[PDB]
Design an enzyme around this catalytic site. Structure first.
Site, PDB file in Angstrom:
ATOM      1  N   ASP A  16      49.630-145.970 -63.044  1.00 25.77           N
ATOM      2  CA  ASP A  16      51.210-145.650 -63.483  1.00 25.77           C
ATOM      3  C   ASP A  16      51.515-144.955 -62.675  1.00 25.77           C
ATOM      4  OD1 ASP A  16      50.130-142.917 -63.368  1.00 25.77           O
ATOM      5  OD2 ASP A  16      49.517-142.660 -65.287  1.00 25.77           O
ATOM      6  N   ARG A  30      57.290-143.407 -62.377  1.00 25.94           N
ATOM      7  CA  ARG A  30      55.997-143.535 -63.523  1.00 25.94           C
ATOM      8  C   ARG A  30      56.730-143.335 -64.321  1.00 25.94           C
ATOM      9  NH1 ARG A  30      52.589-141.728 -66.680  1.00 25.94           N
ATOM     10  NH2 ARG A  30      51.642-139.624 -66.415  1.00 25.94           N
ATOM     11  N   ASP A  35      50.041-142.402 -70.434  1.00 23.48           N
ATOM     12  CA  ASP A  35      48.474-142.272 -68.876  1.00 23.48           C
ATOM     13  C   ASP A  35      47.322-143.005 -68.616  1.00 23.48           C
ATOM     14  OD1 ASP A  35      49.810-140.558 -70.633  1.00 23.48           O
ATOM     15  OD2 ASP A  35      48.749-138.775 -70.253  1.00 23.48           O
ATOM     16  N   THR A  36      47.421-143.562 -67.253  1.00 20.23           N
ATOM     17  CA  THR A  36      46.023-144.388 -66.603  1.00 20.23           C
ATOM     18  C   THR A  36      45.489-142.995 -66.071  1.00 20.23           C
ATOM     19  OG1 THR A  36      47.436-145.398 -64.701  1.00 20.23           O
ATOM     20  CG2 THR A  36      47.232-146.401 -66.211  1.00 20.23           C
ATOM     21  N   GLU A  38      42.893-141.300 -63.624  1.00 19.01           N
ATOM     22  CA  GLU A  38      43.044-140.555 -61.840  1.00 19.01           C
ATOM     23  C   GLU A  38      42.429-142.053 -61.061  1.00 19.01           C
ATOM     24  OE1 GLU A  38      45.956-138.503 -60.617  1.00 19.01           O
ATOM     25  OE2 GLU A  38      46.395-140.017 -62.622  1.00 19.01           O
ATOM     26  N   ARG A  82      60.633-138.727 -59.205  1.00 19.56           N
ATOM     27  CA  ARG A  82      60.746-139.868 -59.609  1.00 19.56           C
ATOM     28  C   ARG A  82      60.903-140.482 -61.375  1.00 19.56           C
ATOM     29  NH1 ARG A  82      53.968-138.620 -60.457  1.00 19.56           N
ATOM     30  NH2 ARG A  82      54.961-137.667 -62.347  1.00 19.56           N
TER      31      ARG A  82
END
Length: 136
Positions: A16, A30, A35-36, A38, A82
């Site tokens: 992401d 971002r 949320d992907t 980590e 970002r």
């Protein structure tokens, strides 16, 4: 109304977070609302489905004819500098695609940056119903 502007891929960092050329400048972006897992967690090395998410994003963007970014109606950058955006590869939203495949979950949401929230939650509910990837 939200508007789509062009961008060029420099490098996918993970599921992401991306480096893009936007307006002639290199920037980290971002993805909004998702949320992907980590891959670089300082704590726990890779999370399950991290490498998968990251390769999904890398494939979809590297094979695209056209990339576009869409800012939402609120803040366009976060506290780390970002860009905060929805990303489209040939007209298909990367944020939604990740969620539809079970490779991302819908994020903690921050008004007013929530225009596509219902669509993404709809895709998330389908991925859960089909028990895909992180939902398996």
């Amino acid at each position: 109304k939200l508007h789509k502007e062009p961008a060029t891929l420099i490098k996918a960092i993970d599921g992401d977070t991306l480096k893009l050329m936007y307006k002639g400048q290199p920037m980290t972006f971002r993805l909004l609302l998702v949320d992907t897992p980590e891959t670089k967690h300082p704590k726990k090395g890779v999370e399950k489905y991290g490498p998968e998410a990251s390769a999904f994003t890398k494939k979809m963007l590297e094979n695209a004819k056209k990339l576009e970014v869409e800012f939402d109606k609120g803040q366009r950058t976060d506290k780390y500098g970002r860009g905060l955006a929805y990303l489209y590869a040939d007209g298909k939203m990367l944020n939604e695609a990740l969620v539809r495949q079970g490779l991302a979950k819908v994020a903690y949401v921050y008004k007013p940056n929530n225009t596509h929230e219902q669509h993404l939650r709809k895709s998330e509910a389908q991925a859960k119903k089909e028990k895909l990837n992180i939902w398996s």
